[PDB]
Design a protein around this ligand. Sequence first.
Ligand SMILES: [Mg+2]
Ligand SMILES: [Mg+2]
Length: 249
Amino acid sequence: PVEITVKELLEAGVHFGHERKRWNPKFARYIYAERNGIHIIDLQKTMEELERTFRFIEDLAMRGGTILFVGTKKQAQDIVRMEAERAGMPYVNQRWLGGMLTNFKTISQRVHRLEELEALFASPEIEERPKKEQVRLKHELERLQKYLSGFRLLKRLPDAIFVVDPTKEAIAVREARKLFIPVIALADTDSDPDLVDYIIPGNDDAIRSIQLILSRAVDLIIQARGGVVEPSPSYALVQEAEATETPEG
RNA sequence: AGGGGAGCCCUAGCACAGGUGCUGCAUGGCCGUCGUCAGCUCGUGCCGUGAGGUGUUGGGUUAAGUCCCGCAACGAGCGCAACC
Ligand SMILES: [Mg+2]
Ligand SMILES: [Mg+2]
């Protein structure tokens, strides 16, 4: 049953039958206290820390600060970009690079090739040598973009970090704290609530939680201070958040 | 008449020429050779008390450290290639 949330998209489900001899284990469902992914233990402990954290995201915001989020799991990545562009800041989906922060003065160079290439495919210099290098410059521009598509907003090392799972993207969190950078992350029982600077004890995994915690973390920024504007947002045309703007091919 | 004097010839004395006369285990120079083999390194960062390691390992591909993907590394140089 899809409570107006599922939407009938002619989803067959012919190959989706439970004929997968799934009728094999009785204890198949070892079930615990994790049936939908919404845990809040001790409350007087977590809610205390939340206010804490979210009070800073607000501060770093107003102080003009910057917050690059760090995403690495498939269980996020894209969920990192939406909350990325919606909130004008740098993000890292694909993969971290040793030094992303403890080497700026060098990884930032890559960012430069990137921009450099991005210039050339805009001037008449297009096509002046063998297709080979033409592609030699396309591979790069392409790759570079794959791994640097979000680091282009880091003219200088950031005031904070928002890594999802400070245990899977630990290098990130190492590099960070080695440079006195408050590290903000999700974290759970299977994490280092000692390393995480400003914790938000959500579910490390679980798409939903992510989008839930990461969004307000994005909205809180945006709503930093305020203003009038009371005609509210429109529904169906929420494309500026990114969605799937203009395709190529 | 003749005398002085410059380039030069000759005897004599001298500084010295000359020497394929030793030493290439004193050397430059140039060459051979492993090897036309695919390799040898550097910057920055990270690991390590340290010598150092990481990158240059791994899967795949290549005539090739050639290229791909991975990865605490990101690059760059000499070489490979291309230029002839
Ligand atoms: Mg070939
Ligand atoms: Mg060869």
